[PDB]
Design a binder for this molecule. Structure first.
Ligand SMILES: Nc1nc2c(ncn2[C@@H]2O[C@H](COP(=O)(O)OP(=O)(O)O)[C@@H](O)[C@H]2O)c(=O)[nH]1
Ligand SMILES: [Cl-]
Ligand SMILES: [Zn+2]
Length: 293
């Protein structure tokens, strides 16, 4: 009456001047038009949830922007529920140190990762066992991990179920299959540059999910975004110990609980070594903690 017909939408397209809004009520995308003065020093990004009014079959007047829970810087997208870090045991060769760096970075940006090992169709019997070994390490560390083959399609349905209702972004090094997976999910190709004015686009797919058509990080050094002294707050399996020993850096402290956990097999030598490498600390003691595997 004096009140507007407010409806909820999601910004799925954001280029220079334009805003594309996916209206949840009908699944249609409308041209979004901000309405108001605070509302233009109010930055609106892909991923932002908005409330507004449908003005006509092709236009939606944006009245409010919901507070966002996170904001990634590549691509520039708000409210990401899962960063899908695509990895492969081989082709390319898995690099656990770089995956650990990437996990630290996404934990810092406050986005939950899901590790997806692709190309399982290429593995021999011994490689399958090695892959299971890495999967156990990451699951024990506290992360969700899935296996898929974008080539055969195996595991893709399980991934779609896992991603229900989520806004997602694909990340991982070149060649792991990010574009192949996006193709399985949406029939679309991952956008790059030219074999600079791209924009961000979220593509609806599966059970009410959305995935970006541009990727997240490929290979990243955690300290480009996280202070070295803060890296320890982003190793998931360290957190229970840090709750009782808030100041322990897990470096030269002789009775460090994390080192004890590594010695007893509760924390993997692989993850602990990545931690020390990231903060650039060499410990002679590592030879005594890591010698069984
Ligand atoms: N054998 C096999 N090859 C795959 C699979 N997924 C992708 N590929 C191939 O891996 C290569 C790189 O895939 P692409 O999607 O471009 O990787 P991206 O650089 O991470 O986007 C291409 O030749 C894909 O056809 C898979 O599950 N099994
Ligand atoms: Cl500790
Ligand atoms: Zn410690």
């Amino acid at each position: 009456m004096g009140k507007k017909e407010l409806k909820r939408g999601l910004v799925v397209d954001r280029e220079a001047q334009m805003i594309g809004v996916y209206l949840f009520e009908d699944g249609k995308t409308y041209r979004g038009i901000p309405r108001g003065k605070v509302l233009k020093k109010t930055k609106i990004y892909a991923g932002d949830y908005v409330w507004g009014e449908v003005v006509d079959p092709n236009t939606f007047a944006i009245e409010e922007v919901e507070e966002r829970k996170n904001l990634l810087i590549r691509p520039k997208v708000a409210n990401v529920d899962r960063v899908i870090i695509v990895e492969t045991l081989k082709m390319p060769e898995f690099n656990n140190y770089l995956l650990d760096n990437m996990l630290v970075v996404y934990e810092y940006f406050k986005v939950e990762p899901v590790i997806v090992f692709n190309k399982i169709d290429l593995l021999n019997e011994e490689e399958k066992k090695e892959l299971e070994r890495w999967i156990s390490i990451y699951r024990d560390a506290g992360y969700d991990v899935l296996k898929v083959s974008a080539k055969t399609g195996e595991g893709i349905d399980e991934l779609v179920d896992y991603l229900e209702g989520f806004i997602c972004i694909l990340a991982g090094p070149s060649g792991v299959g990010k574009s192949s997976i996006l193709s399985r999910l949406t029939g679309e190709e991952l956008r790059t540059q030219e074999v600079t004015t791209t924009g961000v686009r979220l593509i609806p797919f599966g059970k009410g999910s959305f995935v970006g058509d541009t990727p997240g990080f490929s290979k990243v050094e955690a300290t480009m975004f996280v202070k070295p002294r803060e890296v320890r707050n982003y190793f998931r399996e360290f957190l229970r110990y840090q709750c009782k020993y808030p100041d322990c850096t897990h470096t030269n402290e002789p009775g460090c609980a994390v080192k004890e956990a590594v010695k007893n097999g509760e924390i993997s030598c692989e993850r602990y070594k990545s931690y020390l490498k990231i903060i650039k600390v060499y410990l002679e003691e590592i030879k005594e903690l890591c010698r069984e595997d």
